[PDB]
Amino acid sequence: TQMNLKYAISAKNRARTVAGVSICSTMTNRQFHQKLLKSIAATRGATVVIGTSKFYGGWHNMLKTVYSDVENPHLMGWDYPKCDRAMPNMLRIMASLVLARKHTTCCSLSHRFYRLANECAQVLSEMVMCGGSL
RNA sequence: UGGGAAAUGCUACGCGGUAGUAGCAUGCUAGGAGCAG
Ligand SMILES: [Zn+2]
Q1: Out of A7, A96, A125, A128, which residue is the most buried by the measure of CB atoms under 10 Å away?
Q2: A93, A120 in Cβ contact below 8 A?
Q3: A44 Cα–ligand 1 center, Å
Q4: Residue of A88, A97, A130 whose CA lies nearest to A4
């Protein structure tokens, strides 16, 4: 995985970073996961709001769907300090397990395990080329 | 002795096809830009 510095505008001098991934990983991941990702992005009015425009009154519909029948409602929100740098890898494994539950028929058992192994070898913990070294 | 067809032109109507013109909606593609995590 190659690492690079960003070039954008922000309100704190801490640096930002992007990471490019090799091509074979992207090809195989697209083929394995694309259908579910599209299905998630298409569905409207659910718990996950990825793919819902904030234009044309979509924002109002989201804010109304969350405001379902709650007797004494209040509003609550929180913040994760260093979410990307500090997520314990057990939860990442479990997250990658949930997304793969859809593959009951398109894949066997050993195929599922090897797909999980490739994912952990390519994205979870592997060799990062920063500067000029590994 | 209470029996009539066709070839021509005009007009009107409808259909079909052709072309050209304008409008509408969409589907694709390409390009450029902006926002968010
Ligand atoms: Zn599969």
Answers
A1: A96
A2: yes
A3: 25
A4: A130
